[PDB]
Paper text:
In mammals, bicarbonate regulates the concentration of the prototypical second messenger 3′,5′cyclic adenosine monophosphate (cAMP) via the stimulation of soluble adenylate cyclases (EC 4.6.1.1). cAMP is solely produced by adenylate or adenylyl cyclases (AC), and its intracellular levels are tightly regulated. Mammalian cells express two different types of adenylate cyclases: the well-known transmembrane ACs (tmAC) and the more recently discovered soluble adenylate cyclase ([name]). Soluble AC ([name]) is found in the cytosol, is structurally and biochemically distinct from the tmAC enzyme family, and is synergistically regulated by calcium and bicarbonate ions. Here, we describe the first crystal structures of a mammalian [name], and the application of fragment-based drug discovery methods to identify small-molecule inhibitors of the human enzyme.
The next round of synthesis focused on molecules capable of forming a hydrogen bond with the side chain of Arg 176; this was an attractive design idea because the side chain was easily accessible and sits at the mouth of the ATP pocket. A number of heterocycles were then synthesized that could retain this hydrogen bond whilst improving the π-stacking with Phe 336. This culminated in the discovery of the novel lead compound 8 (IC50=0.36 μm). The designed molecule induces a movement of the side chain of Asp 99 to form an additional long hydrogen bond with the benzimidazole of compound 8. The molecule also forms a hydrogen bond with the flexible side chain of Arg 176, although the geometry is not ideal. The inhibitors were discovered by fragment-based drug discovery and occupy both the newly identified allosteric bicarbonate site of the protein as well as the ATP pocket.
Numbering used by the authors: 1 to 468
The structure:
């Protein structure tokens, strides 16, 4: 008998799993909302803003209307190399944003020490990818890396058709603090990462006015062999591709059709992405430079450090947010959480969802979300930034691990406005002028100097319809 090889491995369920971490793909938890779980791990935060700041120049007429296509091509070329490093060193890419990716090595407490060594070596090899790299003069094709370790909480929230997850807690807070202290080419360890690490492996230096540390060198002991050490570490890595599947980047590439599993996983993925997965939309339709309105919603909690309290509050806010967005075909693109604010990146005018009066509707939707979430138990402060303009939209990442992402100055501006003007709804000049709403519905704001924004233009508070 003949023995033809190569199984089919391009099923819809596999294409869906590319959009999700192993944390979700192999998660098998209750469909109850909110769901919370607790574990330990090492977190890696890779700041990729250095090369995603490329977006505004790809709007230049020099790119002859192929700006979005060239942008996603060069972005994915560089991001795929980072992704391959994380995956081969045994990490799980949790999420992509325009400015960062976050990765997790989930492990039992006893193994934190050795796993930190694996993650430091991975971090240094990521920097190694960009050591002699540039385009057109500027060599800002480099990264900054923050590492944390310790207790991690997971939250899954959503309704009967959509799901979202977050990792939260002190190690999550720590990894963002570590990454913010980093300069180009740095690897920063959180204080707890440094307290838990194998100090014989590494040479550090102090960070001024900080308990966090910078890695100068990984200088192993004399008889150390990283390959044999890594093999020992794989004992604790549940989904590391092995044996017959050692040639694959992800075990998720071996997923077989399972309708109950697929029903669960598709809830995390936008319908237009599912349409492409199902071969009912051209594979390149979602890569575009597109005018959108960003509505960036930040929620700050009474007790920041209480996972048990914030879970129901995010769920209650989500239930209201999703009902208000449905009304104008607004979408939640991402949910993020670090400085204990939970942030919803909402988008109006995505592909096939663009409708007249985007601007008025985005403002009314922001006000509605603001009023409801302010009355939600345990939510201390709601802040909403609204910015409109040309943003890049596209699937960002590696073939085996990628996400639909929005990138652009107006994304960064809405994110900065909600942090710099807390407790209010703010909008940019485009939204204000284009709403055509009466001038007295707004308040002209003092100009603030905001991180990573230069010519922000006049900013406004959306006061609303009444003096009250
Ligand atoms: N927690 C989380 N659980 O899963 N993913 C989380 C997360 O936070 C994350 C993941 C990947 C990238 C990322 O980018 C940094 C960022 N955080 C932002 C907050 C507000 C505005 C803009 C922001 N950019 C964040």
């Amino acid at each position: 008998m003949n023995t033809p090889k190569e199984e089919f491995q391009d099923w819809p369920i596999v294409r869906i799993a590319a959009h999700l971490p192993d944390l979700i793909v192999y998660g098998h938890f209750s469909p109850e909302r909110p769901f919370m779980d607790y574990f330990d791990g090492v977190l890696m935060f890779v700041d990729i803003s250095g090369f995603t700041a490329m977006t505004e120049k790809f709007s230049s007429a020099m790119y002859m209307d192929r700006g979005a296509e060239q942008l996603v091509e060069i972005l994915n070329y560089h991001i795929s190399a980072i992704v391959e490093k994380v995956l081969i060193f045994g990490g799980d890419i949790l999420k992509f944003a325009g400015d960062a990716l976050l990765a997790l090595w989930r492990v039992e407490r006893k193994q934190l020490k050795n796993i930190i060594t694996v993650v430091i070596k991975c971090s240094l090899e990521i920097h190694g990818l960009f050591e002699t790299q540039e385009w057109e003069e500027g060599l800002d094709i480099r990264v900054k890396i923050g590492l944390a370790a310790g207790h991690i909480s997971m939250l899954v929230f959503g309704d009967e058709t959509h799901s979202h997850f977050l990792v939260i807690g002190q190690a999550v807070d720590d990894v963002r603090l570590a990454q913010n202290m980093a300069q180009m080419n740095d690897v920063i360890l959180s204080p707890n990462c440094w307290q838990l690490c194998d100090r014989s492996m590494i040479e550090i230096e102090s960070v001024p006015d900080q308990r966090a540390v910078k890695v100068n060198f990984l200088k192993p002991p004399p008889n150390f062999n990283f390959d044999e050490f890594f093999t020992k570490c794989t004992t604790f890595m549940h989904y590391y591709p092995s044996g017959e599947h050692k040639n694959l980047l992800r075990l998720a590439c071996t997923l077989k059709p399972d309708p109950e599993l697929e029903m669960s996983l598709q809830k995390y993925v936008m319908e237009s992405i599912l349409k492409q997965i199902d071969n009912k939309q051209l594979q390149g339709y979602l890569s575009e430079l597109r005018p959108v309105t960003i509505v960036f919603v930040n929620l700050m909690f009474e007790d920041q450090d209480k996972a048990e309290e914030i879970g129901p509050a995010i769920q209650d806010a989500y239930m209201h947010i999703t009902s208000v967005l449905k009304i104008f075909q607004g979408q939640i693109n991402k949910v993020f959480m670090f400085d204990k604010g939970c942030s919803f990146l909402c988008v109006f005018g995505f592909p096939g969802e663009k409708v007249p009066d985007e601007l008025t509707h985005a403002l009314e939707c922001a006000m509605d979300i603001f009023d409801f979430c302010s009355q939600v138990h345990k939510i201390q402060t709601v802040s909403i930034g609204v910015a409109s303009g040309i943003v890049f939209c596209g699937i960002v990442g590696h073939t085996v691990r990628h996400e639909y992402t929005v990138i652009g100055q107006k994304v960064n501006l809405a994110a900065r406005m909600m942090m710099y003007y807390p407790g209010i709804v703010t909008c940019d000049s485009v939204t204000y002028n284009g709403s055509n709403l009466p001038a007295y519905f707004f308040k002209e704001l003092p100009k603030k100097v905001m991180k990573g924004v230069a010519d922000s233009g006049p900013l406004y508070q959306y006061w609303g319809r009444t003096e009250k």
